Amino acid sequence: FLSDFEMMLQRKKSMSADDVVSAMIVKMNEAAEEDRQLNNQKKPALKKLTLLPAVVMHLKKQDLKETFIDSGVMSAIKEWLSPLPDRSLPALKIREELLKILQELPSVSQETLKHSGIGRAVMYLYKHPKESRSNKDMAGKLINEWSRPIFGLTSNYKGMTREEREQRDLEQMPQFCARARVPMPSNKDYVVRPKWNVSRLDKQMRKFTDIRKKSRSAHAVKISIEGNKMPL
Amino acid sequence: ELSDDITQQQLLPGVKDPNLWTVKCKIGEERATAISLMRKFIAYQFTDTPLQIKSVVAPEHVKGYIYVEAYKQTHVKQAIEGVGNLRLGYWNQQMVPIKEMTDVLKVVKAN
């Protein structure tokens, strides 16, 4: 039989998906198609905008971003960013959140952009005249961010190796007073990288510290003297 | 016929390009400074300590600074050393991040 102590300990100890991602993408396609039908009926296309919170709250899950990208999220986002039958842009919220998500979804490979058409779908919004300036800036930076890899460029300055900088620095090398005067830092351009210039007491002190601790007039429950850190 | 913007994405700046550094100039003397900084560059280019700077951008929409492009920040400085209107931006120059460089040569619509 279990002891009440072990029941308590086990009870407290007891406190410590690709299929649902696929189903989410299916629901995103259903929502965008229903909004196409509603737009043809000249009704408000609420389905995408009604699902948006649930979708955004899941695309942010760091542990699933690979699953999301590999499951065809880029295709669904392209469908949501695409203009409707009357060539109107999607709800402002959809553009704002999906563009922000795409910035936070950097693992996207070139083949993924080319196959999903998400690049076309964002370049479209970047060119589009009815797009707001903030969305145009997001689309612009997305287009730069996604095109740099095509040209092998990169924007992470911490990404260039040490030897690359040392080599580049060699590639770029050219051919009275009455009081103390504060000297100013050397402006010299350093090219060349310099070669490097290369207990019995604490046991007794710990023992004495332990004796000091042992001598204290401590109490089992720390009484709040002035009401600070009062429990519950 | 390749579109103009697509042929443009190719030119973007990378980590391997000379960084564009902000400096600080006396307002309305940014153009007079950048040009005088050309005369400084020309005067030193043949001596033993030529200026290690590549370009100095003084946008019209901005009012307060010229930007010096140089591989290493300290190159910007040796150029601006002793230059008067730029004496204010001598102690510090902020690198405009690689993603906020294309929007320095941004012009929105002289006329």
């Binding site: 080319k114 690049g119 076309r120 370049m123 479209y124 | 390749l2 579109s3 697509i6 994405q9 190719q10």
Partner: peptide, 13 residues
């Protein structure tokens, strides 16, 4: 080849 890649990825008529 590289601009054609960018054209196919961002080409919008």
């Amino acid at each position: 080849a590289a601009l054609q890649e960018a054209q196919e990825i961002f080409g919008v008529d």
